[PDB]
């Protein structure tokens, strides 16, 4: 978060595996994997997108 020091807030970073409607509102995104990022002091947040796959590998 490259913003001012007095800018505080929160964000939701969501990963939703495939096979359904892509998220378009916070209502649907939370149901998948999600992380709530607080922008208070630390400027960074990490979302580890896990390995969910039917195949052992994915085509590029």
């Amino acid at each position: 978060f490259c913003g001012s020091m007095m800018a505080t807030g929160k964000l939701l970073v969501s990963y939703a595996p495939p096979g359904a409607d892509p998220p378009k509102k916070r209502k649907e995104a939370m149901l998948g994997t999600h992380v709530i990022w607080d922008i208070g002091l630390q400027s960074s947040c990490t979302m580890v997108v896990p390995w969910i796959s039917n195949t052992t590998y994915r085509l590029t």
């Binding site: 007095m6 929160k10 939370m30 999600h34 607080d38």
Partner: protein, 281 residues
């Protein structure tokens, strides 16, 4: 038996005898973080636990969803304008159309569950206010009609995730033809008829915008019964009331949003059957 300061029992039956800021918590696939949360309240100092057979009334094998239902659902957000008196959400009635927990509670007859409620509200250093979040057990609320008692309807007493609101002043439902059968809880009386000041006896936290922006409550399962119907009985109830009104830079229209994130914990169910399809509107 000569007791200290001759006690002889003459009747077989016993009744006849004489007389800190940082927090990050993960539930299932959901994670919550808060860098300025002022610790957590384990309501009544009891962590939620699965039903123990030593105190198990029903026999049927219990279905525990585990990860699929013990997740953090974020209920809708509500604006904390200056002239707002409070809000109240009954549980588990709030999580009735939330993911698979709603499906499980509607399908299964009996169900028990603890909760983890995270109330989130953040404001700048220049904002001024304070919320109080109380987890009222068996939270009842007063009706709107002085001509009848206990007349509230199921639809109006279970708003869902939308929640309810506290009204500044009482107003009788004078309509005698088609009574609204609607809650009218006065803000300072807390609805039950008690006083707000004493409401701190309940498990509670305070979200003081100068100090903390979050409030975590781990509510165990309290009930006269080990397991009880979830569609009828609402065990707990969250009431958020602003102890001190919002204020900001002498501005007469300051708004900030308040969000709730509730996670069922150690939720167990019994008695599967046709799915309840209640009338709510």
């Amino acid at each position: 038996q000569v007791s200290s300061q001759t006690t002889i029992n003459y009747y077989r039956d016993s009744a006849s005898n004489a007389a800190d800021r940082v927090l990050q918590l993960t539930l299932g696939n959901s994670t919550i973080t808060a860098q300025e949360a002022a610790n957590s309240v384990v309501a009544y100092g009891r962590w939620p636990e699965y039903l123990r057979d030593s105190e198990a009334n029903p026999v049927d094998q219990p279905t525990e969803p585990e990860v699929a239902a013990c997740r953090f659902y974020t209920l809708d957000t509500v604006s904390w304008t200056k002239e707002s008196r409070g809000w109240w959400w009954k549980l588990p009635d709030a999580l009735r159309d939330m993911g698979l927990f709603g499906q499980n509670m509607y399908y299964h007859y009996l169900g028990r569950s603890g909760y983890t409620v995270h109330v989130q509200c953040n404001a700048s250093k220049f904002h001024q206010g304070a919320l109080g979040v109380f987890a009222v057990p068996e939270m009842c609320l007063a009706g709107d009609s002085n001509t009848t008692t206990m007349h509230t309807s199921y639809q109006n007493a279970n708003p869902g995730e939308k929640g309810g609101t506290f009204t500044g002043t009482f107003t009788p439902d004078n309509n005698q033809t088609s009574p609204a059968r609607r809650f009218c809880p006065v803000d300072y009386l807390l609805g039950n008829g008690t006083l707000l000041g004493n409401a701190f006896v309940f498990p509670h936290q305070i979200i003081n915008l100068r100090t903390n922006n979050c409030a975590t409550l781990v509510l165990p399962y309290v009930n006269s019964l080990s397991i009880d119907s979830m569609v009828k009985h609402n065990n707990w109830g969250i009431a958020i009331l602003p102890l001190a009104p919002l204020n900001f830079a002498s501005e007469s229209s300051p708004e900030i949003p308040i969000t709730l994130t509730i996670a069922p914990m150690c939720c167990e169910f019994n008695g599967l059957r046709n799915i309840t399809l209640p009338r709510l509107q």
